[PDB]
Motif scaffolding. Structure first.
Motif, PDB file in Angstrom:
ATOM      1  N   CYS A 189      -3.157   3.487  -5.768  1.00 47.24           N
ATOM      2  CA  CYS A 189      -2.854   3.435  -4.333  1.00 47.24           C
ATOM      3  C   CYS A 189      -1.827   2.375  -3.933  1.00 47.24           C
ATOM      4  CB  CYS A 189      -4.141   3.298  -3.533  1.00 47.24           C
ATOM      5  SG  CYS A 189      -5.342   4.597  -3.904  1.00 47.24           S
ATOM      6  N   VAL A 190      -1.146   1.784  -4.911  1.00 49.01           N
ATOM      7  CA  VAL A 190      -0.117   0.816  -4.631  1.00 49.01           C
ATOM      8  C   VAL A 190       1.260   1.367  -5.027  1.00 49.01           C
ATOM      9  CG1 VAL A 190      -1.552  -1.290  -4.447  1.00 49.01           C
ATOM     10  CG2 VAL A 190      -0.373  -0.801  -6.682  1.00 49.01           C
ATOM     11  N   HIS A 219      -5.766  -2.346   2.748  1.00 45.45           N
ATOM     12  CA  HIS A 219      -5.278  -0.994   2.977  1.00 45.45           C
ATOM     13  C   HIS A 219      -5.768  -0.407   4.298  1.00 45.45           C
ATOM     14  CE1 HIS A 219      -3.917  -0.973  -1.119  1.00 45.45           C
ATOM     15  NE2 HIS A 219      -3.481   0.283  -1.036  1.00 45.45           N
ATOM     16  N   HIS A 247       0.340   4.037   1.374  1.00 48.49           N
ATOM     17  CA  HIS A 247       0.339   4.740   2.660  1.00 48.49           C
ATOM     18  C   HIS A 247       1.527   4.340   3.578  1.00 48.49           C
ATOM     19  CE1 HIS A 247      -1.403   1.648   5.317  1.00 48.49           C
ATOM     20  NE2 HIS A 247      -2.275   1.351   4.353  1.00 48.49           N
ATOM     21  N   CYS A 254      -1.707  -4.422   6.978  1.00 48.35           N
ATOM     22  CA  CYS A 254      -1.730  -3.717   5.701  1.00 48.35           C
ATOM     23  C   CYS A 254      -0.776  -4.346   4.718  1.00 48.35           C
ATOM     24  CB  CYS A 254      -1.446  -2.235   5.896  1.00 48.35           C
ATOM     25  SG  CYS A 254      -2.774  -1.342   6.737  1.00 48.35           S
ATOM     26  N   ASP A 308      -7.458   6.244   0.459  1.00 46.46           N
ATOM     27  CA  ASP A 308      -6.460   5.935   1.475  1.00 46.46           C
ATOM     28  C   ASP A 308      -6.084   7.216   2.226  1.00 46.46           C
ATOM     29  OD1 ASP A 308      -5.121   6.827  -0.853  1.00 46.46           O
ATOM     30  OD2 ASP A 308      -3.487   5.392  -0.705  1.00 46.46           O
ATOM     31  N   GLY A 310      -9.799  -2.093   0.677  1.00 45.69           N
ATOM     32  CA  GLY A 310      -8.530  -2.263   0.007  1.00 45.69           C
ATOM     33  C   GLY A 310      -8.652  -2.066  -1.480  1.00 45.69           C
ATOM     34  N   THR A 311      -7.618  -2.453  -2.184  1.00 42.81           N
ATOM     35  CA  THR A 311      -7.532  -2.240  -3.620  1.00 42.81           C
ATOM     36  C   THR A 311      -7.315  -3.551  -4.365  1.00 42.81           C
ATOM     37  OG1 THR A 311      -5.080  -2.005  -3.631  1.00 42.81           O
ATOM     38  CG2 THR A 311      -6.358  -0.021  -3.079  1.00 42.81           C
ATOM     39  N   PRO A 344       0.846  -1.209   0.000  1.00 38.63           N
ATOM     40  CA  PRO A 344       0.000   0.000   0.000  1.00 38.63           C
ATOM     41  C   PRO A 344       0.875   1.250   0.000  1.00 38.63           C
ATOM     42  CG  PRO A 344      -0.766  -1.597   1.641  1.00 38.63           C
ATOM     43  CD  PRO A 344       0.636  -2.005   1.225  1.00 38.63           C
TER      44      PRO A 344
END
Ligand SMILES: O=C(Nc1cncc2ccccc12)[C@@H]1CNCc2ccc(Cl)cc21
Ligand SMILES: [Cl-]
Lengths: 299, 302
Positions: free
Chosen positions: B85-86, B164, B41, B145, B187, B174-175, B39
């Motif tokens: 988002c990855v 996520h 983040h 995560c 996120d 999540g994705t 992730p």
């Protein structure tokens, strides 16, 4: 947050699954070091000493993936056949053979033709059966736990009883329960609920914010067992009360206090309410499973 | 016989789990060939979480800021890029345990196995479904995560989910492995709520067929229904509309059991109206919706 029926990661066990063929019969084998363990009924009122003596090494076709292993010896230990092979499994994990008690849980790696198709969690019922998911060809599939880096093999599948429940042995070939490995009239005894496991699952629900079933009351262990015996629940021992200690400390709800919740739940039901997305009391999570899942222990 | 909530064997996915560290944050990564997916983040602090500018935060990072650990071996990050988002961390070693894999984006109602991990180490495996509100009812603690959801059909691993976050209700978002969130989730630590969840109707029907295949017929009735009358009833119990595609998908099970889809629909309507009356279906006192028509066929036949 969340509580799921969670199995141990099956990777260490997948590297041990092989296909064992003898005549028309094809089932699964567990390849550890230079031995393949499988149910002895692969050779099949059977006289297994008589049937095995007639077999030679080349009658057993062992297949590890797309590689044929050569059998160099064969011996029988209780209801398990031990096939000595020329090659030691390079993927042999650190392992132990352990015999479990009723109420204990384990993961099952269901296999067909030496190939793992699924993994699920289950408990050894007090009547020594397992409520598994097995079709023809699953014989030889194994049940296990992981403690740190060690795989504890505790079950090998042999058969399905007329009620759809499963019977099997430990890895030393000793059946769990009063079963025999033959086609004859056999019935699972009347099942009971694993009391210590229901209590552990009630603690897991508290840890997850489900408190509706909690009450101000407590009970003596004796009064709880008199009630529990009426509802086909296993007697709760002082050892069980001691094992629930950490959960009792974490949630601030004494074991006998949680027993009073269970006592009310048995006599009054759920009344349209659910605990952890379930309308029934779940008994296939031990006190250790709850601690492991609500703390996140890795393997 | 028997029906269990069954997950795919996690072995092929265990060999891909690594630990990814960036500053104070430590989560999981998926190591496939020479790329570690995780992730995005992981580059954030908790004070840069309400409104993070990931393009801005990532540009400030260098390869040596990302500490990737595969077992007791440190992998060397040689590049980093962000895809939605990855975060994709190019490493100097290709994973020798890389299985045959695909990245697949699933639809609500689909099931998958989750290999829950902490510090790049697998702790458990469970089965779950993409809820119609695009959340998953997982079992995740802090540090999970980067844990992934997958299906292992044949010898290929189809990665469909990367964990996520946890929403305030205890559900998870999540994705897919391309970093596209399932649902209207971002996120960010902003106010986000899962939409009202509904029951995956096609999955309940598939599980009713699994019960028939296993000898459970008590819920069956002499009635049938139109698809329209079924959906008018289903909507009132917070059940997802059953489409003609769902009716078509249930065709094989209908053929195997000899119970028409609209006939099984009338059983479900009756169950919704009456409840179970102290009875169970496949050892459950509630209607199960986390088995797809494909899961039922696979578990009951192969
Ligand atoms: O949700 C998150 N992590 C977790 C993930 N899963 C289960 C958890 C359980 C308990 C605590 C944390 C958990 C992180 C941290 N909390 C805010 C936040 C906001 C946005 C994003 Cl994308 C990630 C996160
Ligand atoms: Cl899909």
């Amino acid at each position: 947050s969340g509580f799921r029926k969670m199995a141990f990661p099956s990777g260490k066990v997948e590297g041990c699954m092989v296909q064992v063929t003898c005549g028309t019969t094809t089932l699964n084998g567990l390849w550890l070091d230079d031995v393949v363990y499988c149910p002895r009924h692969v050779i099949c009122n059977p006289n297994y000493e008589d049937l095995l003596i007639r077999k030679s090494n080349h009658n057993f076709l062992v297949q590890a993936g797309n590689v044929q292993l050569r059998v160099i010896g064969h011996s029988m230990q209780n209801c398990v056949l031990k096939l000595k092979v020329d090659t030691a499994n390079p993927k042999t994990p650190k392992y132990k053979f352990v015999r479990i008690q009723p109420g204990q849980t384990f993961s099952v790696l269901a296999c067909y033709n030496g190939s793992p198709s699924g993994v699920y969690q289950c408990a050894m019922r007090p009547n020594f059966t397992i409520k598994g998911s097995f079709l023809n060809g699953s014989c030889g599939s194994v049940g296990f736990n992981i403690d740190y880096d060690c795989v504890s093999f505790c079950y090998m599948h042999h058969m399905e009883l007329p009620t759809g429940v499963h019977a099997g042995t430990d890895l030393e070939g000793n059946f769990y329960g009063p079963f025999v490995d033959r086609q004859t009239a056999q019935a699972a005894g009347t099942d009971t609920t694993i009391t210590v496991n229901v209590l552990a699952w009630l603690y897991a629900a508290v840890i997850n914010g489900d408190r509706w079933f909690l009450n101000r009351f407590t009970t003596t262990l004796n009064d709880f067992n008199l009630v529990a015996m009426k509802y086909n629940y296993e007697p709760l021992t002082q050892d069980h009360v001691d094992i629930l200690g950490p959960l009792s400390a974490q949630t601030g709800i004494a074991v006998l206090d949680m027993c009073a919740s269970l006592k009310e739940l048995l006599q009054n039901g759920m009344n349209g309410r659910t605990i952890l997305g379930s309308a029934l009391l779940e008994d296939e999570f031990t006190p250790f499973d709850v601690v492991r899942q609500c703390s996140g222990v890795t393997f």
